[PDB]
Amino acid sequence: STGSATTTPIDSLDDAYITPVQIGTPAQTLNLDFDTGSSDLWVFSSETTASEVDGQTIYTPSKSTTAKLLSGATWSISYGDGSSSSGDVYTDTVSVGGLTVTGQAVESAKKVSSSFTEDSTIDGLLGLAFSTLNTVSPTQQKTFFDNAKASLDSPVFTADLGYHAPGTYNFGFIDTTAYTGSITYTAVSTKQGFWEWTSTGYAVGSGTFKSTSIDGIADTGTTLLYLPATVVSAYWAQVSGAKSSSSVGGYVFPCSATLPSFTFGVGSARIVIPGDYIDFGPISTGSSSCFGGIQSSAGIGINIFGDVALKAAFVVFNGATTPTLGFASK
Numbered sequence: 001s002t003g004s005a006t007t008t009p010i011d012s013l014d015d016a017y018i019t020p021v022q023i024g025t026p027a028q029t030l031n032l033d034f035d036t037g038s039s040d041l042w043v044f045s046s047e048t049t050a051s052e053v054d055g056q057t058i059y060t061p062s063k064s065t066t067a068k069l070l071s072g073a074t075w076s077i078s079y080g081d082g083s084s085s086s087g088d089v090y091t092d093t094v095s096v097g098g099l100t101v102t103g104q105a106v107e108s109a110k111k112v113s114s115s116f117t118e119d120s121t122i123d124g125l126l127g128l129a130f131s132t133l134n135t136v137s138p139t140q141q142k143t144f145f146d147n148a149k150a151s152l153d154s155p156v157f158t159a160d161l162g163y164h165a166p167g168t169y170n171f172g173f174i175d176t177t178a179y180t181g182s183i184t185y186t187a188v189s190t191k192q193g194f195w196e197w198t199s200t201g202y203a204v205g206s207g208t209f210k211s212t213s214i215d216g217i218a219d220t221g222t223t224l225l226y227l228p229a230t231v232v233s234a235y236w237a238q239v240s241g242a243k244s245s246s247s248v249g250g251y252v253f254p255c256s257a258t259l260p261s262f263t264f265g266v267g268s269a270r271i272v273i274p275g276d277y278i279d280f281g282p283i284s285t286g287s288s289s290c291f292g293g294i295q296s297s298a299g300i301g302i303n304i305f306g307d308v309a310l311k312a313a314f315v316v317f318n319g320a321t322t323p324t325l326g327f328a329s330k
């Protein structure tokens, strides 16, 4: 089998991407945030605290003839931005762009943190990291990709995130018309449950390439590019007037500044992130100070190739017995 679904930025800043997902019988279509950095499929639901719902489409398990309560199972997750959610678990039928998994664990939110509430466009998450990270207790549950994998034509999925444009998540095949040149594959460590890999270095603008190993994760569920303080300092040094702001919580820059591109290495191949991908607009409405799209990972503990980087490439998440990651220019 294969699946293919259009993914859409939630706002003008590409702060996240949503993908329509069908859950239950009859289908309830929710728009989910596909997240290669976590492994829980969780949804706003009829069971979510009323005060914590504001515009989201909700999953109502009582109206799905295929929904079954998973007795005694709970979940609780906290993400890298301080957000969180929790609830109970159903198994139900889930379809993504024509690809169907029966008996998928659908985690129904009882509680959600304020950040989720305030984002009316995201009805929940669909995790695509490794299933060892799933938070369902006392019995861990499998991700959608893990559940679909044996049935797929090929054990892979691809992320094709758009800059200010629609994009695509494919399952089970590689669309060879979606990129230019070749796909360069690189080794993956699953030891932390992530799509974790090692970039071979970076360049700022037209500057010479710096060969240095940068261990990080491919995370569609993170907006920005988080890299070592040294690297980030070298980037923003090339932006006149940029500085690191404690009050704002990162590098900011004059809104009229010209941002240089940022290149990262994949083996001997290079992916180029155009300067304007790194622009996340005024720090507050009407301000002429803008928030930067490349930030230090020093307080995080891990480097994160989030949407800012990934949307500059066609990315293959190869889930063969030994997983690998593929990057191509596009």
Ligand SMILES: CN(Cc1cccnc1)Cc1nc(C2(O)CCNCC2)cs1
Binding pocket: 013, 015, 016, 081, 115, 119, 221, 222, 223, 280, 281, 282, 283, 284, 291
């Ligand atoms: C525009 N960003 C940079 C910024 C920060 C401060 C000022 N100006 C720009 C911040 C944002 N991040 C998000 C999400 O974290 C995206 C995925 N999780 C849900 C919310 C939405 S707005």
